[PDB]
Design a protein around this ligand. Sequence first.
Ligand SMILES: *[C@@H]1O[C@H](CO)[C@@H](O[C@@H]2O[C@H](CO)[C@@H](O[C@@H]3O[C@H](CO)[C@@H](O)[C@H](O)[C@@H]3O)[C@H](O)[C@H]2NC(C)=O)[C@H](O)[C@H]1NC(C)=O
Ligand SMILES: CCCCCCCCCCCCCCCC
Ligand SMILES: CCCCCCCCCCCCCCCC
Ligand SMILES: *[C@@H]1O[C@H](CO)[C@@H](O)[C@H](O)[C@H]1NC(C)=O
Ligand SMILES: *[C@@H]1O[C@H](CO)[C@@H](O)[C@H](O)[C@H]1NC(C)=O
Ligand SMILES: *[C@@H]1O[C@H](CO)[C@@H](O)[C@H](O)[C@H]1NC(C)=O
Ligand SMILES: [Ca+2]
Ligand SMILES: [Ca+2]
Lengths: 49, 19, 98, 49, 401, 49, 25, 49
Amino acid sequence: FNFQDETPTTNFDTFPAAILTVFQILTGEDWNAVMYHGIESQGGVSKGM
Amino acid sequence: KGPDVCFDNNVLEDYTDCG
Amino acid sequence: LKAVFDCVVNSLKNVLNILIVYMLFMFIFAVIAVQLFKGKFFYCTDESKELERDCRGQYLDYEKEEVEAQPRQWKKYDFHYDNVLWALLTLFTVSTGE
Amino acid sequence: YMGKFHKACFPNSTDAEPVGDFPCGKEAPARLCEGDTECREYWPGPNFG
Amino acid sequence: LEAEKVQAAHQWREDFASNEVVYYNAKDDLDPEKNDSEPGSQRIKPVFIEDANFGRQISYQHAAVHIPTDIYEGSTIVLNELNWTSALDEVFKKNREEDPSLLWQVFGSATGLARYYPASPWVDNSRTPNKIDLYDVRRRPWYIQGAASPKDMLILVDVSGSVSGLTLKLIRTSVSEMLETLSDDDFVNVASFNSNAQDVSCFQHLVQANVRNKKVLKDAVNNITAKGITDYKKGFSFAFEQLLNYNVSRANCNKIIMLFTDGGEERAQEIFNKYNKDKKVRVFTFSVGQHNYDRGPIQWMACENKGYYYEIPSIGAIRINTQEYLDVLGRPMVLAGDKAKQVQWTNVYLDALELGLVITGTLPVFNITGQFENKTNLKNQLILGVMGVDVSLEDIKRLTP
Amino acid sequence: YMILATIIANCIVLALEQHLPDGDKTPMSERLDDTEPYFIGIFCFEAGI
Amino acid sequence: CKGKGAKCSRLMYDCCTGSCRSGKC
Amino acid sequence: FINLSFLRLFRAARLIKLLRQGYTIRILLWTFVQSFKALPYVCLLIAML
Ligand SMILES: *[C@@H]1O[C@H](CO)[C@@H](O[C@@H]2O[C@H](CO)[C@@H](O[C@@H]3O[C@H](CO)[C@@H](O)[C@H](O)[C@@H]3O)[C@H](O)[C@H]2NC(C)=O)[C@H](O)[C@H]1NC(C)=O
Ligand SMILES: CCCCCCCCCCCCCCCC
Ligand SMILES: CCCCCCCCCCCCCCCC
Ligand SMILES: *[C@@H]1O[C@H](CO)[C@@H](O)[C@H](O)[C@H]1NC(C)=O
Ligand SMILES: *[C@@H]1O[C@H](CO)[C@@H](O)[C@H](O)[C@H]1NC(C)=O
Ligand SMILES: *[C@@H]1O[C@H](CO)[C@@H](O)[C@H](O)[C@H]1NC(C)=O
Ligand SMILES: [Ca+2]
Ligand SMILES: [Ca+2]
């Protein structure tokens, strides 16, 4: 998640950060923003979808 | 030709200010 | 429509004994949130000054494709637990998830 | 809604990135460019496309 | 002499409302605005005549003051400096009175201020859109020159995997701004390590820090990418080996290592104990970035190697920390009381308050509060500032008919 | 109970791993990857039993 | 803390006094 | 016209034949929709709010 020139608060690097990101997706707040960031992290709309 | 006199490595210098 | 309103009010009376428990539990949570975060939700316009003394004057803003001297302001966050009423509003916005 | 998010406010003859992350259009009810910019043919879209 | 004497007899304060400090701020608009005053300072409004020597508005009645935008002009440090520099103002008057040919003569304070005698408005950056004032006296070549002795840097950049993204941006900008504080008497190379240490550029040793070499190093640092696992031992081995090269031209003085990392759990005690045991080489460690890595070994390398530890969380913190290692390097110069007070002239440069080509003669000012009445002498190892006086190059041209 | 103990230890070892952007590795990651064959052996041992 | 109108990322949440909408605070 | 090309909805609306084909989902939807149509003043209360 470091492609944006800065790592988000909701990253999957450490385990506390990953568990907080998963909890925030469970609460359903900005899960789409994390989805966009995870699609771009794996390529982009071209191949990371 | 570089400068002749320069000041470094004093023994009275207090290094306990690592900030 | 009066019958539907009466049904809604009857439901509100049915859940009124759990609304009081809900409000009490959210009140303990709001007071704990105050004690945790009372006065700590302050910031400068520049992320390098950590006090209100240091937060006066101007600073270089490297965020508009051109540097500019923006003023240094010791502002507060929008939802900030600085109070039991503010903590209740902040925790309500948290509970709705937004 | 197929392909309608790709026309963004692009500068003049600069071949640069668009201003604003919003779609635009030249028609009547759509959002029009302002400040001497044009709705060009491709911009990947909002939320990275 | 007067600056040292009048700072020795200064009493620290925290209240200036009861006793205002009266001074002319260079970046004051000419409008008669009664509401442009700070709580603790009353601003002078001067009468500006046009002078042939300077080509600007010049007031001989008082000295002007320049305070950078990023520095608040009413804090305690700034207000105390503005209080005790009035004797400097008077000696400015005396100097110009005994020699009417003097150009800008200035006290470059280590708090950020700058107090030059002929009161003239700042160049174009008082209050003008798109004309931002980035001037800082402590980056100026004459201040860099008079604040310490010639360096032998070696910037270790930590281009490993964990520095990708914002950290690498801040590291390359920080290395550029660090190189921009090296004169032509200073020798520098830039190395970079990720499980293997290498030169970032075509240079294989310490090269002189002139404009061309500094540009080459800057291009190499800008062209650098982050990948791989860190190794603090193979990097400091490279640094200490390149500082042991005596086949090349050098300034045999002030050996330094600048470590631009983020953080880690590796202290490398044995590398230091092997290469730096007499502690001839300093190590300044910079923890660049906004992250949550361990910063203990980084702060320990600076302690056990006479260095200092700086943090650069974001662009905007870059400018201040370079001035600060140079603040550290001047401790041995202070302790040499009067053998270190010698006049030095800088390379030909273009004056800020535009005068053309000038050379500046610098002399550092020492903090002498506790002296011969010895006290704890907490920060008596740092210079107060540097005094400079400009000599016009067209003034030298008139002595060669 | 010892199988549950190894499973819990494996969960802690997985929660102790931290990922770095471009091939970088935390020094503890090598230890947490050298502790893998123990868990593999114990799991294959119970599988064989 | 990014000021109003500054270019931001949604997931950064460093958008004091507002939120990162369409890449701008 | 504003309604120049709304006619494309009919080809997509032909899909409801498979909704008819789906037995238990058809009974479920019919049950819940006929319950909704029997509750018009609840929706009137929400609309008045
Ligand atoms: C030159 O060195 C002298 C001393 O070596 C510096 O003076 C000392 O400055 C410190 C501040 O760093 C003063 O401590 C302060 O005292 C006030 C009032 O007591 C207190 O409110 C502060 O919290 C802080 O403790 C100290 O009193 C002062 N004098 C002495 C004798 O130590 C001086 O600042 C140095 N020059 C410059 C330009 O900084
Ligand atoms: C479930 C109840 C939560 C709703 C709380 C709303 C509070 C609205 C007011 C908050 C700010 C007022 C505080 C004034 C203090 C000077
Ligand atoms: C008194 C609160 C009114 C507003 C709350 C609406 C949202 C509540 C739904 C909970 C969202 C989390 C995901 C679903 C799991 C319960
Ligand atoms: C410092 O401030 C005091 C009170 O305003 C003043 O009397 C004194 O002259 C000032 N120091 C100098 C060197 O002018
Ligand atoms: C320098 O830049 C060129 C062009 O972008 C690139 O091919 C080369 O790899 C860069 N140097 C290094 C050491 O990566
Ligand atoms: C310097 O020269 C000597 C002899 O010419 C050689 O042995 C050595 O490898 C050279 N380099 C260094 C870094 O000493
Ligand atoms: Ca939402
Ligand atoms: Ca690393």
